[PDB]
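pipeline: protein-struct stage 2 | run 1193 | Fibrinogen alpha chain
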Amino acid sequence: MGTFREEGSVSSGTKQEFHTGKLVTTKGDKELLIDNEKVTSGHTTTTRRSCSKVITKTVTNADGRTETTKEVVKSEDGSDCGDADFDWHHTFPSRGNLDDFFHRDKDDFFTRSSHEFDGRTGLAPEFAALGESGSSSSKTSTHSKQFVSSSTTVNRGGSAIESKHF
């Protein structure tokens, strides 16, 4: 029925979905340049790592001049990484207590038991000087014939005057 152009399979694809509709299948980019990163994830990482502070600069040259600055710096001030740290100090659980170390809260009459020497009294055995004690007497001793005693014969005559001889 009409030869038209029948010869074997003047067509394409197991079935034409919508007749031809493309000149060049190779090139065809006309909007693929769309932003891939889009407004979302997009920051540096190989150069420096956020959060903490990490700076690494490595340069290699042919004359063997190669400076390695692969250095790493801890957090800058614990902005959002080295948190929970502030400064080392630790703290003891709870020591005993006993009395005050020096504040001396409630004082007391019992002061320091200083073995000083506030002594000063010294009664002597006996005042060796006056000695007016005893009983107002001391001349008594050898009992010398100091006491006068002989005036008496002049007393009354033993009888009467009488010149015997003459």
